[PDB]
């Protein structure tokens, strides 16, 4: 909740101030005076998806169109946080679905990405949660989700493989059972 | 209808300027109620058209059954939920059944439905249904790719997001080989 | 103000409902029922720059540095509204400046773009307001601002020149007086 | 300079602060995906700030060889940390210099980027420090440094301008005094 | 100037001439595919030369507003007819100008391209006419016009140089006298 | 077939018609830039329709070789320039041809020459596309032929609908290129 | 496995061999630019072959998660630097790995660490490709693994055939990646 | 096979023929720029046809390894320079080779050397494509081989039809590359 | 200069050193996949350093023919870092303004081969190409730009995957006249 955010902000700032001292830095120097608070607020914003529910995000934007054709929202910018290192992983989400007389509002597909990506995560879980949320909200014939991301933990440190990218895929309903629907989806997201 | 409704549209746009905190009397805004009203009538000019007039009897005989595609047709529509543009491209394919449509008419058909208050899904289906009813072909495939400004300039603000809708009728739905040839040739 | 927005929202919705009827549409059909309110909110968001002042936007993010080298923030996505047709014009803003004793917070250069772009505008005025705001806030040796935009009024209607783009340029202080400074700026924004 | 003994001693304090952040965000620090996170996040942050453990003399490692023509090392991948939000800023560094009978080892130019980028920083300071370090180590006729970076604090939050990039430039010696040397440098780094 | 009355009076004469061309080429004007061709070719030709029906004053439509900046409208799609062979030449027009107290409506620069390009022409004349029309309408400090076009007379026939392109340039006022203004224009139209 | 003698005899009639068009458009046929136009436009139009002067037999010129070759042959990116028969305005693009020989192999250049016979006429894309495929089929008797034509029609860009980016793609698949989807897929993959 | 003590003991022997190579090439090991070369070349060669010092278990470091996922996971564009065992000249490129988990998901970075164990050795592209796929299969027991290696061999560009654009692509498909063409096709579509 | 002794003996005859060509074109063989041309043109033509001096066995040089690899091996983007037998004008491009080894794996560079044996001759694209595939098939006895050649023929761009962008693509699929479409699809996807 | 007799006498020494290197790395130089490696590695190293055998006069081969800019750009270059004995590869772009003599186009690339096929440092290699052209033709000026990826900076050490080194040498009018140098740099893009 927003009350939880206000109550936990000083605790987060104290932890960030302690990190600055433990790294050998001077929390009292000009450039670092407001850093405990700004880092705490940024981390709250990066994890704002914990504050959201699918019902509020959908906001009744479910329409009735006699549509039994493929709908895709691709190149949705995604910014998440690795739960192992607390370092960002960023990329794109491509979503496809085959409606079953209930059609979702286009923007709501990107809002669903925001609920789960703005959390401490792993790409596999994030990919599956987006597909399951759309499946449960719309009850469509099928859903396909592809996430492509650069993990900063693999480029700025560790293995330091500058070009590496992780691609995760989740195919539910007809997107799993019918290879032709999955192939049309993968062709159209290029 | 356009001439009669132009002053009502201009009165509504002038009222919007005042309600936003702007000064409708300032030099840059004096003609805005009229220009905005004319622009909105042009963006919704598809309501003035019928398929028959647009086709203009441009249907010719072609005995050999080959796939015909008109791709990269620039499309400019209006979102019916926010009254903000959604723009992109339409790619149309069909397999004739002895009748072939005039090439330009495929783009004119896009103009009838796109120049209206719409939703991408309905727009995509209308183009495919109009071609199906006009030509009675073996099948039709329509792919619409668009940037909705309501998802980039506001709301979710996902700068690169694009919506892709597809409608496959007749052999384009029943035969995956026909649909695959269409999708390969529109790249 | 936000109070002005709440008070004027029903008047904006009434005007948008009237526009739906005047276009030949049915405001009672499912797809249009909430449109007067949604269009009103979208228009208020597109013109939220009238709710801001340079001082609040700057938020005292002016640092003292021994930096007398070129600073550029380029490819700032910009979304504005043509004041003549009430149709969007969108593109990018590239800003460069040579600090004297004060250096502005990087994000404030993009926030300055937001104060002026979220208004009913003309590209030339927008370009000049960004350069003047930076000049008055920082008193630098010079500022350069380049705005490149697609006007939907020239693409979706009127002349209908699909590829046309407007580029405006404002060069102040050393960016006007010293061609070498302006050339370095234009080379670095490519 | 920060030592490896300081790192071992401060690691538990950093881990305690990161565990506290996990709890203050509303997360479950006992869940499988978070069990080792306090330690992994602490190690990642020590690696991101390893530049405090280095000195120019150790980094140079006597790699100065006995030429008065332009030498450039461009597209050096750079990963830094914003000191205001503790969020990465990443991109590229392009360095050019005109030797004065002493040529630096090519790799040492990238190692100099590492000393200063692996710290809590601001782009302007980082750009100046690289140019000054090369100037003091080699005493060349001049040095030019261009840093281009995406600040995640401007993409994942705040203004959320997905394409925004910051470009900073420092020109010293003949790179400032002679526009022809600076022009050759900027042409060759494209 | 040519009028819709002249158009309707000359349409049967144009159609008779196109029918005669069909017979003189060895074709059968009575075959299904050619029956309406004399009329459709005649209408297309009078649309390609619709520029003779226009005047600068009507096209400007008083869209002159009351700046210290370079204004450019680039990538204006241009379609003209070669006067020597009556075959299209197509490409792009890039216009730049420095206003002197009067600023022209953005779309009018593209409308000015339409008056002169929709005629039987030579590229050099078309380029000069656009620059002269802007100069006389606005009285600016200077104007620069660059036209790049593929002549179908050089690709479909004659020399048959598939990739050949003609680039013509006209620089007036400060765009001719000040190389710095011309260089800024050429850099910004890339 | 149209002859060079027919061209000489009809040139003055074409020039008179083009001179008449100049006057009917409001132009001055006597101005310097237009003096030679009736003749130059007439010659250009005869060159654009020179395909009526040619035969498949003359164009092939016996360039049919024998071989134990049963592998795919493609000539792609053949620049094509044609004239729309409805508006007498160019349509331009590329032709991609594939075929599976049946012991007879056509000379590589002849595939582009076949494109020239039919494209240099008053046409429609669909007719042009089948004519190229049918000519190859009848000349070689191969296992199959595939023809893909991609073109920009200037009548859809410079006028009418004015859709700047629009392109027409027509496809003709005969023999094994129609019956075997695997052969057609190899062809479409290799022409990218 | 090779140890850090073995590296310290063998460093002078490697330096003596590199100093001998400098003399045998006609160079002067005493000139300023070559004085430290025997030691730096020796250290670089030990770094290029550091994969002999590693074991899969240490490299994995228990980064196997037991959070179910029955969907395709790919780590593509992993920069790869190896050494040809026949010429002792580098071959460099990228590795693209895909797998279908069977209730065990590997840490993303470990897939790149697996590439490092085998590529930092004297190798042959075919063996390298197979070792990465086998190591993942044995560590995770997944439904299947696919590995694609694309590399420029400097032995084919700087010498020998001297084909400057040549690239070698090797592929290994195990489990469902071999048995189910639909799984393999999804993998190859997603690595583009 | 043509020998280096044959080259020395025939060099004056080639130079006499090239000197005669200079005179027959209206040129002056005595002008400074043409004095050595008969000899340089003769040496260049011998180099362009040096493939007649080679045999598959010498080129392979026993570079056949018995590592039992059951996975796809590709060498793509092999620069190819050949000579059209019909006009004596170059045709240049790229060769992409794929194979599935059975019990024998060929040395990577030998696939490019096989391209050199056949391309450095007076050729026709179809024959060249087939020869490369048949040589690999006979040398290794693999499960299958796929060869794709893409080339620009200067006879179709500098003269004749003068289609500046035209490209010829030839394909040969043997063994499992013909019988299994899934193997052929993996090959064509991996050579993009 | 290095002779073919020196190559025959020194090839054995290089092979014995590579065999010793294989053993010192923990490998088995007796295993099937390494049996021919000492000889192959020795031959590859001789090929990479064949430039010490070449003289400018032999390479030129009298290809000098009897006042506008001439450029040969995108010359593929493969050299060896003298500090680590690892390749550095890229492109060389050469421009010159002839006086009365014009060199044969290929000789500019053959001059790149003389100096690049040696143990080098990019700076020296760039200068040696410009000086060789200057001394052979006595032109009004020469400009040389070398762009290279050093494998010692990507496969090891700093491991900066995208890093590139660009070195430049401008002699005669290419140094003295900035307009000549600008024409050269614009034309090599
Ligand atoms: N499957 C999956 N895995 C994920 C994330 C995010 C992170 N991870 C992975 O957790 C592992 C942690 O291992 P560890 O304890 O050994 O840490 P550490 O020494 O710092 O590792 P390293 O990075 O090698 O230096 C790493 O392998 C990392 O990649 C995700 O989205 N999906
Ligand atoms: N399927 C479909 N849906 C369409 C369009 C055009 C628009 N829409 C969608 O109508 C929904 C309206 O929702 P709402 O009432 O909650 O509004 P609002 O708070 O302003 O939303 P948001 O924009 O998210 O801030 C949105 O989801 C929008 O995307 C289309 O073509 N196809
Ligand atoms: N300098 C400048 N000019 C601007 C804007 C925004 C708009 N404008 C321009 O005002 C002019 C208004 O003219 P008008 O009355 O004739 O309208 P209308 O018939 O609808 O025009 P048209 O579009 O041709 O159909 C147009 O030329 C338009 O382009 C800007 O940012 N900078
Ligand atoms: N010149 C310079 N400036 C730098 C950095 C790194 C960061 N900054 C800038 O410090 C300012 C601090 O502002 P603030 O206190 O108001 O914070 P906050 O509300 O979170 O801001 P915001 O991001 O707008 O939400 C911001 O403007 C930020 O951009 C750098 O390298 N160079
Ligand atoms: N400066 C200028 N020149 C222009 C145009 C348009 C056309 N032209 C040129 O008039 C010349 C007429 O010559 P001509 O009589 O010999 O014609 P013709 O034998 O058919 O020629 P060709 O095409 O070579 O076969 C041609 O050279 C043509 O290119 C333009 O915009 N600017
Ligand atoms: N299938 C096919 N159709 C072709 C060509 C070439 C042209 N055409 C098409 O003939 C139709 C004629 O219609 P019409 O009489 O109404 O003309 P007109 O008012 O001038 O039309 P418009 O252009 O819309 O303004 C148009 O649809 C045009 O596109 C081709 O190759 N294949
Ligand atoms: N399959 C496979 N093969 C590999 C490597 C690495 C190298 N090789 C290949 O071994 C062969 C050695 O033969 P050889 O004795 O004739 O040597 P040499 O005269 O120097 O040859 P060449 O280079 O042509 O001059 C070459 O064909 C080389 O390419 C690999 O990873 N996979
Ligand atoms: N299948 C195949 N065909 C090949 C080559 C190489 C060349 N050719 C083709 O031999 C034909 C010879 O015909 P011809 O006698 O009529 O000559 P000529 O008048 O000069 O022709 P043209 O060029 O049109 O002027 C041409 O069609 C040429 O393309 C190849 O590799 N594969
Ligand atoms: N100016 C110049 N310098 C060149 C080359 C080729 C190489 N070098 C540079 O010699 C230096 C040697 O340093 P060193 O002793 O410390 O070795 P080592 O610890 O292994 O280094 P490192 O690689 O950092 O790990 C490095 O800086 C290397 O880059 C060139 O062409 N021009
Ligand atoms: Zn991580
Ligand atoms: Zn909307
Ligand atoms: Zn407007
Ligand atoms: Zn920050
Ligand atoms: Zn012409
Ligand atoms: Zn037409
Ligand atoms: Zn090798
Ligand atoms: Zn030929
Ligand atoms: Zn090195």
Tab-separated table of N, CA, C and O in Angstrom, chain G residues 35-94:
chain	number	residue	atom	x	y	z
G	35	UNK	N	60.844	-7.205	-24.863
G	35	UNK	CA	61.439	-7.609	-23.583
G	35	UNK	C	60.501	-8.417	-22.648
G	35	UNK	O	60.913	-9.444	-22.102
G	36	UNK	N	59.259	-7.981	-22.506
G	36	UNK	CA	58.319	-8.658	-21.631
G	36	UNK	C	57.389	-9.651	-22.332
G	36	UNK	O	56.670	-10.384	-21.675
G	37	UNK	N	57.436	-9.677	-23.659
G	37	UNK	CA	56.594	-10.535	-24.492
G	37	UNK	C	56.609	-12.020	-24.079
G	37	UNK	O	55.521	-12.577	-23.960
G	38	UNK	N	57.746	-12.686	-23.785
G	38	UNK	CA	57.665	-14.110	-23.366
G	38	UNK	C	56.709	-14.345	-22.191
G	38	UNK	O	55.969	-15.325	-22.198
G	39	UNK	N	56.676	-13.415	-21.219
G	39	UNK	CA	55.815	-13.518	-20.039
G	39	UNK	C	54.363	-13.159	-20.322
G	39	UNK	O	53.454	-13.842	-19.839
G	40	UNK	N	54.137	-12.119	-21.099
G	40	UNK	CA	52.783	-11.732	-21.404
G	40	UNK	C	52.099	-12.712	-22.359
G	40	UNK	O	50.932	-12.997	-22.205
G	41	UNK	N	52.841	-13.229	-23.326
G	41	UNK	CA	52.296	-14.233	-24.238
G	41	UNK	C	51.958	-15.491	-23.449
G	41	UNK	O	50.907	-16.093	-23.684
G	42	UNK	N	52.840	-15.891	-22.508
G	42	UNK	CA	52.616	-17.072	-21.678
G	42	UNK	C	51.363	-16.910	-20.811
G	42	UNK	O	50.555	-17.842	-20.767
G	43	UNK	N	51.178	-15.735	-20.158
G	43	UNK	CA	49.997	-15.472	-19.331
G	43	UNK	C	48.725	-15.450	-20.182
G	43	UNK	O	47.712	-16.000	-19.770
G	44	UNK	N	48.778	-14.827	-21.381
G	44	UNK	CA	47.621	-14.781	-22.282
G	44	UNK	C	47.213	-16.206	-22.680
G	44	UNK	O	46.041	-16.525	-22.557
G	45	UNK	N	48.175	-17.068	-23.034
G	45	UNK	CA	47.899	-18.458	-23.395
G	45	UNK	C	47.309	-19.275	-22.228
G	45	UNK	O	46.453	-20.133	-22.448
G	46	UNK	N	47.752	-19.010	-20.989
G	46	UNK	CA	47.174	-19.670	-19.814
G	46	UNK	C	45.722	-19.193	-19.619
G	46	UNK	O	44.862	-20.005	-19.275
G	47	UNK	N	45.439	-17.919	-19.878
G	47	UNK	CA	44.079	-17.394	-19.785
G	47	UNK	C	43.189	-18.013	-20.874
G	47	UNK	O	42.061	-18.410	-20.595
G	48	UNK	N	43.703	-18.112	-22.119
G	48	UNK	CA	42.954	-18.715	-23.219
G	48	UNK	C	42.645	-20.194	-22.934
G	48	UNK	O	41.680	-20.697	-23.484
G	49	UNK	N	43.442	-20.884	-22.105
G	49	UNK	CA	43.198	-22.285	-21.767
G	49	UNK	C	42.788	-22.500	-20.297
G	49	UNK	O	42.923	-23.618	-19.787
G	50	UNK	N	42.230	-21.467	-19.635
G	50	UNK	CA	41.800	-21.558	-18.228
G	50	UNK	C	40.618	-22.518	-17.989
G	50	UNK	O	40.360	-22.874	-16.849
G	51	UNK	N	39.935	-22.952	-19.048
G	51	UNK	CA	38.834	-23.905	-18.929
G	51	UNK	C	39.268	-25.277	-18.425
G	51	UNK	O	38.461	-26.024	-17.855
G	52	UNK	N	40.558	-25.622	-18.615
G	52	UNK	CA	41.100	-26.882	-18.090
G	52	UNK	C	41.158	-26.848	-16.540
G	52	UNK	O	41.184	-27.888	-15.912
G	53	UNK	N	41.178	-25.661	-15.931
G	53	UNK	CA	41.195	-25.492	-14.482
G	53	UNK	C	39.793	-25.633	-13.841
G	53	UNK	O	39.693	-25.574	-12.613
G	54	UNK	N	38.715	-25.741	-14.646
G	54	UNK	CA	37.364	-25.713	-14.101
G	54	UNK	C	36.616	-27.016	-14.173
G	54	UNK	O	36.866	-27.829	-15.063
G	55	UNK	N	35.646	-27.195	-13.260
G	55	UNK	CA	34.731	-28.346	-13.278
G	55	UNK	C	33.304	-27.823	-13.364
G	55	UNK	O	33.034	-26.744	-12.844
G	56	UNK	N	32.391	-28.562	-14.006
G	56	UNK	CA	30.994	-28.153	-14.138
G	56	UNK	C	30.348	-27.848	-12.783
G	56	UNK	O	29.684	-26.823	-12.639
G	57	UNK	N	30.569	-28.708	-11.788
G	57	UNK	CA	29.985	-28.504	-10.461
G	57	UNK	C	30.386	-27.186	-9.807
G	57	UNK	O	29.519	-26.504	-9.266
G	58	UNK	N	31.672	-26.817	-9.853
G	58	UNK	CA	32.115	-25.551	-9.269
G	58	UNK	C	31.534	-24.368	-10.032
G	58	UNK	O	31.111	-23.383	-9.426
G	59	UNK	N	31.513	-24.474	-11.356
G	59	UNK	CA	30.995	-23.437	-12.226
G	59	UNK	C	29.492	-23.183	-12.013
G	59	UNK	O	29.074	-22.023	-11.974
G	60	UNK	N	28.712	-24.244	-11.822
G	60	UNK	CA	27.270	-24.154	-11.605
G	60	UNK	C	26.936	-23.464	-10.298
G	60	UNK	O	25.932	-22.750	-10.236
G	61	UNK	N	27.790	-23.715	-9.318
G	61	UNK	CA	27.712	-23.154	-7.995
G	61	UNK	C	26.330	-23.220	-7.375
G	61	UNK	O	25.873	-22.181	-6.898
G	62	UNK	N	25.634	-24.379	-7.507
G	62	UNK	CA	24.305	-24.650	-6.955
G	62	UNK	C	23.209	-23.730	-7.526
G	62	UNK	O	22.147	-23.644	-6.915
G	63	UNK	N	23.407	-23.095	-8.679
G	63	UNK	CA	22.438	-22.174	-9.237
G	63	UNK	C	21.442	-22.908	-10.104
G	63	UNK	O	21.314	-22.667	-11.290
G	64	UNK	N	20.761	-23.837	-9.467
G	64	UNK	CA	19.718	-24.627	-10.085
G	64	UNK	C	18.484	-24.364	-9.253
G	64	UNK	O	18.478	-24.583	-8.045
G	65	UNK	N	17.503	-23.748	-9.886
G	65	UNK	CA	16.284	-23.370	-9.221
G	65	UNK	C	15.208	-24.399	-9.456
G	65	UNK	O	15.097	-24.956	-10.532
G	66	UNK	N	14.428	-24.642	-8.415
G	66	UNK	CA	13.367	-25.634	-8.460
G	66	UNK	C	12.010	-24.997	-8.474
G	66	UNK	O	11.103	-25.428	-7.771
G	67	UNK	N	11.883	-23.947	-9.277
G	67	UNK	CA	10.646	-23.222	-9.459
G	67	UNK	C	10.233	-23.615	-10.844
G	67	UNK	O	10.940	-23.286	-11.797
G	68	UNK	N	9.159	-24.428	-10.952
G	68	UNK	CA	8.669	-24.988	-12.210
G	68	UNK	C	8.529	-23.969	-13.315
G	68	UNK	O	8.166	-22.811	-13.085
G	69	UNK	N	8.833	-24.415	-14.516
G	69	UNK	CA	8.721	-23.648	-15.737
G	69	UNK	C	8.747	-24.704	-16.826
G	69	UNK	O	9.670	-25.517	-16.887
G	70	UNK	N	7.674	-24.774	-17.599
G	70	UNK	CA	7.559	-25.767	-18.662
G	70	UNK	C	7.574	-25.083	-20.031
G	70	UNK	O	6.873	-25.508	-20.955
G	71	UNK	N	8.392	-24.025	-20.160
G	71	UNK	CA	8.494	-23.212	-21.360
G	71	UNK	C	9.958	-23.001	-21.825
G	71	UNK	O	10.888	-23.194	-21.053
G	72	UNK	N	10.149	-22.605	-23.086
G	72	UNK	CA	11.475	-22.455	-23.652
G	72	UNK	C	12.309	-21.287	-23.096
G	72	UNK	O	11.818	-20.161	-22.989
G	73	UNK	N	13.566	-21.584	-22.737
G	73	UNK	CA	14.491	-20.612	-22.214
G	73	UNK	C	15.677	-20.539	-23.151
G	73	UNK	O	16.275	-21.559	-23.463
G	74	UNK	N	16.060	-19.318	-23.561
G	74	UNK	CA	17.178	-19.134	-24.445
G	74	UNK	C	18.122	-18.078	-23.905
G	74	UNK	O	17.675	-17.063	-23.381
G	75	UNK	N	19.431	-18.305	-24.027
G	75	UNK	CA	20.421	-17.269	-23.781
G	75	UNK	C	21.189	-17.237	-25.113
G	75	UNK	O	21.822	-18.229	-25.493
G	76	UNK	N	21.031	-16.152	-25.867
G	76	UNK	CA	21.652	-16.037	-27.175
G	76	UNK	C	22.711	-14.934	-27.211
G	76	UNK	O	22.826	-14.147	-26.263
G	77	UNK	N	23.518	-14.910	-28.298
G	77	UNK	CA	24.579	-13.919	-28.503
G	77	UNK	C	25.621	-13.934	-27.404
G	77	UNK	O	26.102	-12.880	-26.992
G	78	UNK	N	25.942	-15.122	-26.897
G	78	UNK	CA	26.995	-15.237	-25.891
G	78	UNK	C	28.322	-15.156	-26.633
G	78	UNK	O	28.632	-16.069	-27.414
G	79	UNK	N	29.106	-14.077	-26.411
G	79	UNK	CA	30.426	-13.918	-27.015
G	79	UNK	C	31.322	-15.076	-26.663
G	79	UNK	O	31.379	-15.493	-25.511
G	80	UNK	N	31.990	-15.621	-27.674
G	80	UNK	CA	32.768	-16.828	-27.501
G	80	UNK	C	34.140	-16.662	-28.108
G	80	UNK	O	34.254	-16.272	-29.275
G	81	UNK	N	35.172	-17.031	-27.352
G	81	UNK	CA	36.553	-16.933	-27.812
G	81	UNK	C	37.250	-18.261	-27.513
G	81	UNK	O	37.367	-18.672	-26.357
G	82	UNK	N	37.661	-18.946	-28.555
G	82	UNK	CA	38.326	-20.238	-28.402
G	82	UNK	C	39.634	-20.261	-29.183
G	82	UNK	O	40.019	-19.258	-29.796
G	83	UNK	N	40.337	-21.376	-29.123
G	83	UNK	CA	41.598	-21.534	-29.805
G	83	UNK	C	41.561	-22.819	-30.628
G	83	UNK	O	41.268	-23.905	-30.095
G	84	UNK	N	41.905	-22.721	-31.899
G	84	UNK	CA	41.956	-23.890	-32.748
G	84	UNK	C	43.102	-24.796	-32.283
G	84	UNK	O	44.237	-24.357	-32.175
G	85	UNK	N	42.812	-26.070	-32.036
G	85	UNK	CA	43.858	-26.972	-31.547
G	85	UNK	C	44.839	-27.362	-32.632
G	85	UNK	O	45.953	-27.745	-32.295
G	86	UNK	N	44.460	-27.262	-33.895
G	86	UNK	CA	45.346	-27.630	-34.980
G	86	UNK	C	46.363	-26.553	-35.364
G	86	UNK	O	47.435	-26.877	-35.829
G	87	UNK	N	46.039	-25.286	-35.150
G	87	UNK	CA	46.956	-24.214	-35.517
G	87	UNK	C	47.377	-23.279	-34.385
G	87	UNK	O	48.287	-22.491	-34.574
G	88	UNK	N	46.700	-23.375	-33.241
G	88	UNK	CA	46.899	-22.505	-32.065
G	88	UNK	C	46.653	-21.053	-32.442
G	88	UNK	O	47.439	-20.157	-32.129
G	89	UNK	N	45.548	-20.836	-33.142
G	89	UNK	CA	45.116	-19.527	-33.604
G	89	UNK	C	43.647	-19.369	-33.158
G	89	UNK	O	42.897	-20.338	-33.187
G	90	UNK	N	43.229	-18.190	-32.666
G	90	UNK	CA	41.827	-18.045	-32.205
G	90	UNK	C	40.723	-18.276	-33.237
G	90	UNK	O	40.877	-18.034	-34.430
G	91	UNK	N	39.584	-18.733	-32.747
G	91	UNK	CA	38.341	-18.769	-33.497
G	91	UNK	C	37.304	-18.153	-32.565
G	91	UNK	O	37.261	-18.482	-31.378
G	92	UNK	N	36.585	-17.146	-33.063
G	92	UNK	CA	35.723	-16.347	-32.218
G	92	UNK	C	34.353	-16.156	-32.823
G	92	UNK	O	34.214	-16.065	-34.047
G	93	UNK	N	33.355	-16.015	-31.965
G	93	UNK	CA	31.996	-15.783	-32.433
G	93	UNK	C	30.970	-15.726	-31.330
G	93	UNK	O	31.174	-15.056	-30.311
G	94	UNK	N	29.837	-16.422	-31.549
G	94	UNK	CA	28.719	-16.420	-30.629
G	94	UNK	C	28.160	-17.814	-30.462
G	94	UNK	O	28.228	-18.645	-31.375
